[PDB]
């Protein structure tokens, strides 16, 4: 669609109507819209910096900036073909946002596929209210998940307690293992205590799965016997 003129100039048309005498009474919105001018510029704006990683867009390194040879052993003496092409599209494209965590996360759920099965809630609660110190993995108001491992890894690297990504990742992983072992032991011991003290449970996960399997299998029984009868003829 073309940039539309009529939507934002309603005040001007109404002013013409009023001054000409075509309209006698000012609309209630007239004074408000006059006090608050609509934004009447619709321009594609250049972007020179990628916020996610800080890469600077629109920079060319001149020949003079290299007084030494490159990896192949060649001095840069003249611009090459790619350097001699105007890159306005690079300025006007929306920059792709890339984060380091996105890699480690992909590693973590590759290393621990069953951690994916633990349900996640994407409803944000309140982002601004987060007050976390990442010297320790467990945070109040937060679950214990792989993202905690990546956050602890980034905290470790930021403080330079460890140097390489792998080392901090491994340390956070081992803290994660300890904490999850503790939680598993709490769950097992709690169930054992409940059975120790007379608690009676109507249904368990195995029996629930067996029940659902039984319904599905009964329907499948009916359908298979009917289909065998149909196919025989």
């Amino acid at each position: 669609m073309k940039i539309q003129t009529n939507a934002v100039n309603v005040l001007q048309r109404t002013s013409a109507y009023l001054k000409s005498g075509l309209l006698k009474e000012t609309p209630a919105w007239y004074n408000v819209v006059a006090s608050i001018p609509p934004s009447t510029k619709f321009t594609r704006e250049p972007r020179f910096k990628n916020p996610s990683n800080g890469h600077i867009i629109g920079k060319l390194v001149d020949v003079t900036e290299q007084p030494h040879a490159n990896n192949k052993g060649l001095y840069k003496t003249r611009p090459n073909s790619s350097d001699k092409r105007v890159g306005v599209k690079r300025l006007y494209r929306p920059p792709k946002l890339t984060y380091v965590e996105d890699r480690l996360r992909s590693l973590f759920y590759k290393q621990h596929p069953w951690e994916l099965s633990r349900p996640k809630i994407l409803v944000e609660n309140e982002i601004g209210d987060e007050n976390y110190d990442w010297s320790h993995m467990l945070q109040i108001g937060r679950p214990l998940d792989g993202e905690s491992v990546i956050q602890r890894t980034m905290y470790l690297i930021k403080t330079k307690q460890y140097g390489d990504m792998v080392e901090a990742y491994d340390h956070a992983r081992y803290e994660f293992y300890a904490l999850r072992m503790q939680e598993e032991t709490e769950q097992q011991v709690a169930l054992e205590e409940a059975e120790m003290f007379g608690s009676l449970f109507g249904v368990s996960a195995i029996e629930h799965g067996i029940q659902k399997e039984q319904e599905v299998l009964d329907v499948w029984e009916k359908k298979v016997v009917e289909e065998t009868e149909l196919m025989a003829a």
């Binding site: 940039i3 510029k41 594609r44 867009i57 920079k59 060319l60 003079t64 611009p79 092409r85």
Partner: protein, 155 residues
């Protein structure tokens, strides 16, 4: 001094105004730089910047034969009241037909009289003239009593 390049720049500025880009790049030459400066003085362009083919110069770069091929002049366009300030940009003196006017004919052209099939100067328009390898507005060239080549119209 290529009039072909000035025509290409004019078409580029028109196309940029149509799609409403806030910044654009043109070739870095003396004629183009003077033309852009004249447009900027009249208020048709928001800003002039020197840069590479990739973008404006982050730090000041001296111009030498080493980097001349990759140099560009970045102009910021203006869009006011939902309308482009620089709407149409055309050539008067074309490469096939080049028009060099004496001063009196230039006054006549400014005074509503058509000269050599050039439409007379319009009120909110700017006509640029080249005299002694210097680009100026028609009014200045008349005030300087300089006979010159009548290049382009910016309305």
């Amino acid at each position: 001094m290529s009039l072909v390049k000035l025509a290409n720049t004019c078409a580029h500025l028109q196309n940029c105004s149509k799609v409403r880009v806030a910044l654009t790049s043109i070739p870095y030459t003396k004629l183009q730089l003077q033309f852009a400066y004249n447009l900027y003085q009249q208020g048709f362009l928001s800003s002039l910047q020197k840069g590479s083919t990739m973008g404006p110069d982050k730090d000041f770069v001296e111009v030498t034969p080493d980097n001349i091929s990759t140099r560009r002049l970045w102009v910021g366009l203006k869009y006011r009241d939902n309308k482009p300030v620089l709407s149409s940009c055309k050539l008067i003196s074309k490469p096939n037909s080049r028009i060099h006017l004496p001063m009196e004919d230039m006054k006549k052209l400014c005074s509503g009289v058509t000269i050599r099939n050039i439409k007379p100067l319009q009120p909110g328009e700017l006509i640029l003239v080249r005299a002694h390898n210097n680009i100026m507005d028609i009014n200045e060239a008349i005030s300087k009593k300089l006979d010159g080549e009548v290049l382009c119209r910016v309305k």
